[PDB]
Design a protein around this ligand. Structure first.
Ligand SMILES: Nc1ncnc2c1ncn2[C@@H]1O[C@H](COP(=O)(O)O)[C@@H](O)[C@H]1O
Lengths: 113, 115
């Protein structure tokens, strides 16, 4: 899905530790984990950033969050977690393919960066 | 009651004040009273859902709508350099109000890790 490293991961051209897959998204552990559990849920559709998501994408974006919730439960995050979507330079977005990050296994702090 | 028992339900029913950015039949966006960035607002469903870990499969479109409204509000507020969206779940997530909400923070460089 697209011209980024996340596209390569979706196409199985480079490895990742995959947690879950369906016909429209992929969940996998982040290569630079910031918490004992840290994974990403990404759409297979190449949406470059949340700021350009269209109205028709509403269901899909919600699906990323539901899949994120389910994977977090499966990975034993019973004390909680934080979901994060980064947009643009101020948001610290590292790849221009929409991704929902899920972090847990430790106390998350405030402010969130 | 429509909106639930938390302070966010009271905000939905206009029983306590808020600085509202956007409102429709499914959600409400309003500024945070303890901002952690120069712009910091919340997008919440009008349907009470306590936390994302108990959201139902059928809540998918609603959850996505929070994100679309979040990004539209960010644009309308001039966050052209970007922003961070956050959902806190439970104790480790730092959740304090058990009515699910998407926080949007911007107007400064956000750092990594995100807490
Ligand atoms: N009356 C209020 N109006 C606006 N924001 C509030 C109010 N009470 C609490 N908050 C914010 O709601 C957020 C709760 O999110 P969390 O702590 O992640 O559950 C915090 O950022 C609070 O500052």
């Amino acid at each position: 899905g697209g011209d980024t490293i996340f596209g390569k991961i979706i196409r199985k051209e480079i490895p990742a530790k995959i947690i879950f897959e369906d016909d429209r998204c992929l969940a996998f552990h982040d290569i630079s984990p910031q918490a004992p559990t840290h994974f990403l849920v990404i759409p297979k559709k190449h949406i470059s950033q949340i700021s350009v998501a269209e109205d028709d994408d509403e269901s899909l974006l919600g699906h990323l969050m539901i899949v994120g919730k389910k994977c977090a439960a499966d990975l034993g995050l019973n004390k909680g977690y934080r979901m994060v979507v980064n947009e643009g330079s101020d948001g610290g977005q590292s790849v221009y393919h929409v991704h929902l990050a899920v972090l847990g296994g430790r106390q998350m702090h405030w402010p969130p960066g």
